[PDB]
């Protein structure tokens, strides 16, 4: 089996966008009048930091980001030189809806608009290298139902 | 030179399938991220690849429940990876 090269030290950047405070959304976006703050989200940022530092990544945390701020951070990394890296990771911790994540301001960012900043054309120094995005957000307001199965 | 697709080599790990919520315990973290980190920390030293790890996250998160609303959560990876992806601990 072919395996991606993964020998650099650090392996690459691991961005963490950690959205807690949604007061701006509650104030500005009528339908989001009751969107809640994401209490506990720092426990995920910390877990990802521990995990990915152990795996030799350079962690770059950013707390409480509006959509425009998220695009700015991504633009910085898209323009960066990743030639000496073997991988790039971006973790987003936020609210969301179908196909989107919310900024703290309640504006929407389609997921594809985030990942597409790192295509081989837009970020040539990551061409041929794995780009990993972890998105911890809702994708709508429905509860997924359960189905009964036999125990393994 | 050789050419591959512009959109090659991506892995997108979603905490949930479309249309649905994902869960956050204020006292522990989210079901998805906590499971992801536990599985990575355990299995990356064993040389397991990320798709195998993400399959385990699917299994683990699928066993959790919200007994207030009778809710479940189904994570979902999507990928254009062209090789095995491992994160060696060394």
């Amino acid at each position: 089996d072919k395996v991606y090269q993964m020998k650099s030290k650090p392996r690459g950047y691991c961005l963490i966008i950690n959205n807690h405070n949604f007061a701006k959304a509650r104030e500005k976006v009528p339908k989001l009048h009751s969107i809640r703050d994401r209490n506990g989200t720092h426990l995920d940022a910390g877990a990802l930091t521990t995990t990915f530092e152990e795996l030799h990544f350079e962690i770059k945390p950013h707390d409480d980001c509006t959509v425009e701020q998220i695009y700015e951070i991504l633009k910085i990394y898209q323009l960066m030189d990743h030639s000496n890296m073997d991988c790039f990771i971006c973790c987003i911790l936020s609210h969301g809806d179908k196909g989107i994540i919310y900024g703290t301001d309640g504006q929407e960012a389609p997921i594809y608009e985030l990942t597409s900043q790192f295509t081989g054309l837009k970020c040539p120094s990551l061409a041929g290298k794995p780009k990993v995005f972890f998105i911890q957000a809702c994708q709508g307001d429905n509860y997924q139902k359960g189905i009964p199965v036999e125990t393994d | 030179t050789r050419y591959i697709p512009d959109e090659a080599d991506f892995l997108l790990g979603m905490a949930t399938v479309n249309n649905c919520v994902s869960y956050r315990n204020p006292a522990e973290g989210t079901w998805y991220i906590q499971s992801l980190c536990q599985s990575l920390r355990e299995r990356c030293p064993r040389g397991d690849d990320i798709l195998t790890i993400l399959t385990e996250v699917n299994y683990e998160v699928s066993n959790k429940d919200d007994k207030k609303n009778m809710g479940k959560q189904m994570p979902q990876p999507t990928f254009t990876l062209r090789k095995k992806l491992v994160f060696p601990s060394d």
Partner: peptide
């Protein structure tokens, strides 16, 4: 438990 809370939802995102």
């Amino acid at each position: 438990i809370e939802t995102x």
